[PDB]
Assembly symmetry: D2
Homo-oligomer: 334 residues x 4
């Protein structure tokens, strides 16, 4: 009674799950089989991503992430989620071998089933941390229950936020990253202005003054906590002010041994956001090719990027020399 | 009301994941990826079988005789290669699993094997892999009951190789009464080889010249061996070739006159059959490299990455018999109009 | 003896890498990646223009009229889409450069601009992006980024026949449109009038259920969509507003190929229409990947102009895509009799 | 003011395309594809050499000893992997050239050879493909000089070897990894119709690890490449990858295997490409072998995988030494 391949993979279920509605209603359409397998393969891969993402969530929730031995496992699993998403984006290439005209021969047999009825796609969006401030009454029972759990349980965004708030170096009576960054950027701007004013009155000099004033407003706006809370409340920002500070600390001090793998995490979170919006864009394109002129387009935006704040740290890049120096004491803490 | 989950029978697809590591109270995280990865391969093997069997059926029932159906044949065979190309990239997901982590659940797999993939064997058999082509360690002893019944059917029913062969034997232009391609081709290669021997013999005695002589003499042996039907039967018997002499003629006719309207899509079909063989071999290669990365030290698998498992090896080997454009027999207005839709 | 390096002119290609950061005394490692990446895109843009110009010529010199040339036209157009697929994947190399590292050398690039890619503009023009339909960046015409010989080539590329115009002309001559022959358009209008009446009658026989109420609104929209197809005045209006590109007769040609693609003479022509949509869709994906790249490097107008290029405006063969709108059940399609089946 | 075309020296890059078929008054369309494809490979080979040299130099000049440099080292080796992946995919473009169309211009290529790609040889050498396991007649002048430098200057393999030898945990008077590992395996192998056969061959595999003389013999054959102490370093990083100081080192070892795999995948696609165009030179089939895998020792550590319970447990004092 040894283990057999087919039994191990429950192929008696996986390979007996293919029912063409076109056939069930006496008008078998060959390409319907493709439509079915493609969706079943997406849903297996959605199940794998939920498996990886729930395991990473738990490592944050149960405090194991506090032990930095576990940062390799956390980054390898998040990196794995992006490798799967890359395959899922490539996988539209298969459904592009189906013409609009052959889709047209079986689409009537699909009504009224909706993509909005993909539980796992909703679970994945909620568990990464997509805003509810955007419906979703398409579910009932055990399914409607899993959705509610996914809505109330801590999102990856919330768990990363809490961990970013504990980033070493933010302590005002320690390294005091924020205090020193505000000072160096202020002095840096004052120096850059004096350099600029010393010049003769060229139109070049006017385009420099105007560039300086733009730079000054953007960089100093980083230190406006009221502005951050206002933008948080409008949904344009997602991380707490202190989590923003921790992310920037990891960005600027990425080479410090304790920050190396955390920097790979932040990168991988941005990759997952990029690949999800590539998924949504290839899908929008697929729908247009099939139905022509005839909400999905609205989902291809920064509104749906959970880690929008990680992207927007590029806005606040400063000359390398303005970054507060690490002395031997804080070099060795890191 | 038809519902997404019900339409796709997700109550089966998403309730088919059972970790043996967990079953035996030592749940290993990466076993889940091992299961999903294979299940995804097996969904796509089923889709390939669906395309492939539909194309076999279009040859078998004679609908292929009506050239309206060539676009459908080429789209479905191209679709098979687009699927296989994703299946080759899909290994990159299993590469995110280290040897160390695989080693933690590996023992719970024994003794289930890849040889027990029914669909992989159905797919090999239906393209046209013969028992004689296969290396042992016999493949059918891994199966029983209705699975053993389906495999037998896969060996006994007409393969894509056989159905393509029958269709290539009927390629217009081969008829000795008509365009008489083979006769004109032998004439023009014999004539072209004579003109070439003459150009070379004209050159001043130099090491370069003697290098061109020996190059010509081997080229002359290769090109003229094309017309040796009994050399062809000998290569059939050793398994170095698979297509009938007449099928080989039909292939080479489509190859040289590809731009003639009636041959445009048939040329794309010959191209897709090579693609399918290349991508099956690339699958075999990535699978071998995957096993090496996970186990270190298998020799059977390395054997499978060779022309012995390429069903349409003859279509690759037509490149061997490339000649100068001007040697290709010219077409008169009557044979031009016969190759027009 | 011809040598590999001499044949490939590697003495030019591999001596064209000058880091501006090094030239001004502060060598930044990653600028070398920035340079190779662009040089690789520009070689491939040259290859695309070589394929594209060869196909334009085949239409322009009348060789396309001999249907034996269709395999060459479709292989070269398929080749263009295979290159564009690689160019889309090539962003993944430049994604290994972090915003912090790009920031160390961006100052040395000023004021060089992607707007100054001559090959990218030639490519857009030759496919058939019209200058009067371009979004202006910084309130200016794209051609004022260029002077002298380059400005002149761009003008030739705008004035010379575009791939859209040549395909348009070829589509106008599609067999089956002749009113005194198969009379495609006439038979299509009649079959759609009929199918619609038959569909109305099936629906009005279904109580007054909310499902029936829905099918009535849905029927009403499809009827307006399908019968607007036959309104040639509405088409000329949309042609002038640039919301369409193909002549009314070209649209008929395309829909003739779409519906009768399995007919032997239409099989490779259908592959050409597919490949033109592929090129549009892959140029849009390039524009999309470039936009995402600009965001990753600079954060959050220039970010908005690039977003404006990821739209149906810049899809030269948008009409081929929009034929999906005019899909009808297979049995409404005019049947082919033995006379036109054989032609 | 700086211009895009001048910054990129397009006046050189886009004026380097000479069809030999055209030069001899029989212009063959597909020859342009053949030239651009090779030019793109060579731009990318140049980028790989730039990355690979910067990494070699970080080892050679001692900066790798400062562990803050490990992110930079793994980023750039990962970048090499990503480029090599594009180059494997890039064969897809030359696959749009039929054998027949190649046949129309291949005569005008003779006698230029692939063996004359300088950068490809520079690349193989700098990584550390050994000469005794294999080309240089095909070059003269400055090119022949650069090839000698690339054979004589320290390879990536040599620099990685040196660095692996200093891997903390090997010191006999410290954690004594090798000592404790030999102990635990032998004690673990203590064990109680059947298939007792597997146990025996298994025992021989595991214990052959501790045969330093076997290793030196295989080292001289070129069937192994890493010094015995390098192999101890490597295995330490493998078993203790989670330890903070080993996490990025483990990524680097993975990247080095990735590069071997992708170079072989390039060799394999190239071999298929030759077979597609010329039919049935296949010396190239020999190059698709572990003989040409510089980091074969890193791949082979999978053979010496043991039950976790046997891996020497780590005490707090060494846990703290590995941060
Ligand atoms: C022929 C191909 C496709 C067409 C025509 C299509 C059509 C649509 C349409 C019209 C919607 C909007 C809601 C609705 O009417 O149901 C939608 C949403 C959706 N589709 Fe598809 N779809 C296609 C392929 C796919 C595939 C391959 C997947 C794979 C899982 C998928 C997953 C979804 C999901 C998850 C949604 C909800 C999207 C969101 O909320 O942002 N679709 N699709
Ligand atoms: C960790 C990854 C993998 C390992 C270690 C592995 C190992 C092996 C081994 C040892 C064999 C020889 C027969 C046996 O004992 O089972 C084999 C054959 C096979 N494996 Fe895998 N395999 C892996 C991944 C895959 C995947 C993802 C597939 C996808 C379906 C697959 C499909 C097969 C097939 C069909 C065979 C039979 C192939 C033939 O006869 O030519 N393997 N594999
Ligand atoms: C770090 C990567 C990149 C950044 C930050 C970047 C940035 C920009 C920006 C700001 C513009 C608009 C204004 C301007 O012309 O300066 C632009 C346009 C453009 N870039 Fe890039 N770019 C990047 C990579 C690339 C690459 C790899 C290519 C390859 C050819 C490219 C080609 C172009 C082209 C052709 C335009 C004009 C686009 C149009 O009119 O639609 N860029 N880019
Ligand atoms: C139609 C495509 C190709 C054919 C027929 C071809 C043919 C060959 C042949 C016959 C050799 C053996 C040496 C010789 O006789 O010159 C070779 C080696 C080589 N080819 Fe190609 N080749 C092709 C494409 C490419 C491409 C795209 C590259 C990209 C740079 C390339 C790079 C090389 C290199 C570097 C070698 C030396 C390889 C080694 O020692 O392992 N080839 N090729
Ligand atoms: O949106 C559904 C299709 C629906 C669906 C049904 C069954 C399985 C998967 C999917 C799916 C995925 N995205 C949309 N859908 C209709 C809506 C009208 C245009 C044709 C498709
Ligand atoms: O090779 C099989 C694993 C086997 C298998 C079992 C269950 C599900 C899928 C697979 C599979 C795929 N290729 C090989 N196998 C054994 C033999 C020793 C090495 C790995 C475990
Ligand atoms: O647009 C240029 C860069 C420009 C360029 C210069 C040289 C080589 C390639 C490129 C390129 C590609 N896309 C935009 N650019 C600036 C504009 C300001 C932000 C930093 C990028
Ligand atoms: O191998 C060379 C071609 C050679 C070459 C010449 C010019 C530019 C690039 C290349 C190349 C790449 N791989 C092999 N070659 C010949 C050898 C005889 C058969 C046809 C190809
Ligand atoms: C002990 C700690 N791991 C510290 C910590 C928090 N966030 C970080 C980000 C980067 C590096 C370290 C940290 C923890 O509190 O989880
Ligand atoms: C009538 C025919 N379709 C002729 C035929 C056979 N093989 C071909 C290959 C290419 C082109 C045509 C054919 C048939 O016999 O099927
Ligand atoms: C004789 C012709 N080759 C006819 C033609 C025009 N457009 C077409 C589209 C599909 C098929 C044929 C045509 C010509 O006039 O070019
Ligand atoms: C001080 C040290 N960086 C130690 C070292 C050597 N090899 C390693 C591998 C992994 C981790 C650390 C090391 C050095 O000597 O380089």
């Amino acid at each position: 009674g040894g283990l057999i391949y087919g039994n191990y993979l429950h192929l008696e279920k996986v390979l007996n799950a293919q029912e063409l509605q076109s056939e069930t209603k006496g008008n078998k359409i060959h390409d319907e089989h493709l439509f079915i397998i493609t969706h079943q393969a997406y849903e297996l891969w959605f199940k794998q991503i939920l498996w990886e993402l729930d395991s990473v969530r738990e490592i944050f929730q149960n405090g194991h992430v506090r032990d930095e031995r576990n940062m390799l496992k956390v980054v390898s699993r998040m990196h794995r989620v992006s490798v799967i998403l890359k395959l899922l984006v490539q996988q539209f290439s298969i459904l592009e071998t189906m013409t609009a005209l052959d889709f047209n021969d079986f689409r009537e047999y699909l009504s009224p089933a909706s993509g909005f009825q993909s539980l796992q796609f909703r679970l994945l969006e909620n568990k990464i941390g997509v805003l509810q401030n955007m419906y979703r009454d398409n579910f009932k029972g055990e399914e409607n229950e899993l959705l509610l759990k996914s809505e109330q349980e801590k999102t990856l965004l919330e768990l990363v936020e809490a961990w970013l708030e504990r980033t070493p170096g933010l302590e005002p009576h320690g390294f005091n990253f924020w205090g020193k960054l505000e000072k160096n950027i202020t002095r840096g701007l004052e120096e850059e202005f004096i350099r600029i004013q010393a010049k003769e009155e060229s139109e070049e000099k006017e385009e420099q003054v105007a560039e300086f004033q733009k730079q000054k407003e953007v960089l100093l706006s980083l230190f406006d906590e009221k502005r951050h809370e206002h933008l948080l409340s409008k949904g344009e920002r997602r991380l707490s002010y202190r989590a923003l500070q921790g992310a920037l600390m990891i960005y600027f001090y990425r080479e410090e041994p304790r920050f190396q793998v955390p920097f790979q995490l932040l990168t991988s979170l941005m990759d997952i956001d990029s690949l999800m919006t590539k998924w949504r864009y290839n899908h929008v394109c697929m729908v247009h090719r099939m139905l022509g002129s005839k909400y999905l387009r609205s989902t291809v935006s920064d509104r749906y990027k959970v880690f929008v704040d990680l992207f927007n740290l590029s806005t606040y890049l400063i000359p390398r020399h303005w970054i507060p120096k690490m002395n031997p004491t804080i070099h060795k803490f890191l």
